[PDB]
């Protein structure tokens, strides 16, 4: 079990926890039971930005960008209600957490695209 001193400055603190390959199981939902997500984490690996169409007005594509704001990008410690609906579908209702990060990515040619990467009120 890793401590802060094991993690600090490695980059691991910006990584979400992973599960190994044997984890292909199933988690039963009791439709009489109330549920929560205790921690939702989102670690972005690629940011794509839609190029502004030349004027040809064809399909503008999403192009790769380079992250310049370093490993400051993940959303984590997010928690909320997991409702069980009458049709047996599940709905996550985000309540709180570190559910946003400012991010600047840089396009081919130098253009920097700041964004608020977020799942606020998901």
């Amino acid at each position: 079990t890793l401590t802060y001193d094991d993690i600090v400055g490695t980059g691991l603190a910006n990584k979400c926890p992973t599960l190994d390959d044997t984890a292909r199981g199933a988690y039963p939902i009791d439709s009489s039971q109330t549920y929560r997500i205790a921690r939702l984490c989102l670690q972005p690996t690629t940011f794509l930005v839609k190029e502004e169409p030349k004027n040809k007005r064809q399909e503008a594509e999403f192009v790769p960008t380079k992250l310049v704001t370093r490993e400051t990008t993940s959303l984590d410690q997010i928690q909320g209600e997991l409702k069980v609906n009458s049709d047996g579908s599940l709905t996550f209702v985000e309540e709180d957490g570190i559910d946003f990060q400012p991010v600047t990515v840089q396009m081919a040619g130098g253009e920097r695209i700041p964004l608020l990467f977020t799942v606020k009120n998901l």
Binding site: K54, N55, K56, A108, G109
Partner: protein, 56 residues
């Protein structure tokens, strides 16, 4: 003395200074290439190869 349009003939019998002069010329031309490239890169919009290519 030498007329102005003859100033460079001093190199005719000075192979070392002629080599030096050729080096300087070459330096100027390569410096030009570098600076031209830099200026063009400072002005070129690469955003539209279709209707705004370099030759436009």
């Amino acid at each position: 003395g030498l007329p102005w349009y003859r100033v460079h003939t001093v190199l005719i019998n000075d192979p070392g200074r002629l080599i030096a002069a050729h080096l300087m010329h070459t330096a100027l031309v390569a410096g030009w290439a570098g600076s031209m490239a830099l200026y063009e890169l400072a002005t070129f919009d690469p955003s539209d190869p279709v209707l705004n290519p370099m030759w436009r």
